[PDB]
Amino acid sequence: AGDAEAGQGKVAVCGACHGVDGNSPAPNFPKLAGQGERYLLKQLQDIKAGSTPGAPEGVGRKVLEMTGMLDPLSDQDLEDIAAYFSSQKGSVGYADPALAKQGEKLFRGGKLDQGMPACTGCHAPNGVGNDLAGFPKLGGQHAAYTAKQLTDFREGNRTNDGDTMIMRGVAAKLSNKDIEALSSYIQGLH
Ligand code: HEC
Numbered sequence: 001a002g003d004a005e006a007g008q009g010k011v012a013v014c015g016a017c018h019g020v021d022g023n024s025p026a027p028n029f030p031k032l033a034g035q036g037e038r039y040l041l042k043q044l045q046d047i048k049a050g051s052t053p054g055a056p057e058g059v060g061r062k063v064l065e066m067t068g069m070l071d072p073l074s075d076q077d078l079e080d081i082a083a084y085f086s087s088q089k090g091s092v093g094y095a096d097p098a099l100a101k102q103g104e105k106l107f108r109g110g111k112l113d114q115g116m117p118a119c120t121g122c123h124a125p126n127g128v129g130n131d132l133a134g135f136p137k138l139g140g141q142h143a144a145y146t147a148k149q150l151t152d153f154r155e156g157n158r159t160n161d162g163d164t165m166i167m168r169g170v171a172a173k174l175s176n177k178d179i180e181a182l183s184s185y186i187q188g189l190h
């Protein structure tokens with residue numbers, strides 16, 4: 001487990017993009033505030049491994065915007081950072097009903113004709129996730145971020161779901177329109 005207080009002092013480079021508390025309005029940078037600690041730690045570990053120079057292709061999670069950044073941090077440092085951001089209060093954004101009513105139907109009902117489950121069983125009806133179960137919080141997240149993640153799982157650009165194999169299979173069944181709709185709904189969800 002991380003020491004949130006310690007983590008507060010280990011995030012200087014992060015602030016421009018994620019905000020001092022993990023709530024920056026920058027639409028492509030995911031909000032970190034209030035995310036589950038376990039999920040944050042896993043992503044930090046995966047991003048560090050996948051985004052270091054010379055990382056073997058397909059390892060971890062390669063985040064171009066964070067290349068090399070986590071490299072001087074120990075595993076404990078990453079736990080402390082995870083704890084710090086998880087301790088912050090998440091925020092909620094805008095759900096355009098032109099997109100979000102269909103997003104809601106997909107989020108609650110899936111696409112059963114295609115075998116795709118609903119999102120609520122893992123990410124919760126209000127999007128809070130389940131940190132002890134490995135399920136990230138989605139509610140309130142920036143739509144462009146969420147959309148990129150669903151697209152990347154669909155396309156095989158994000159493959160650090162390999163411990164469960166869950167999201168690649170879910171996202172395989174989503175169209176671009178479905179992804180836009182879900183992402184809008186999620187942005188307003190609490
Ligand atoms: C702007 C140049 C950034 C800086 C500085 C840092 N991060 Fe970042 N981070 C950024 C992007 C664009 C992304 C998303 C990449 C994508 O998939 O499209 C991220 C992602 C993260 C995540 C994952 C969050 C999730 O919901 O899975 C984490 C945990 C994260 N970033 C942490 C983080 C920390 C701790 C940083 C300082 C050491 C840091 N980021 C800097 C962009 C930028």
Ligand code: HEC
Nearest residue numbers: 117118119122134135136146149160161164166167170182
């Ligand atoms: C349980 C069987 C799940 C179902 C059904 C869906 N999701 Fe999921 N999702 C699940 C896990 C275990 C993971 C984590 C993968 C990781 O790298 O450890 C996730 C992740 C996501 C993400 C990424 C969040 C981020 O902060 O980057 C998104 C955007 C996401 N899931 C969306 C999503 C939607 C919209 C779903 C219904 C169509 C859905 N998930 C189903 C587990 C499960």
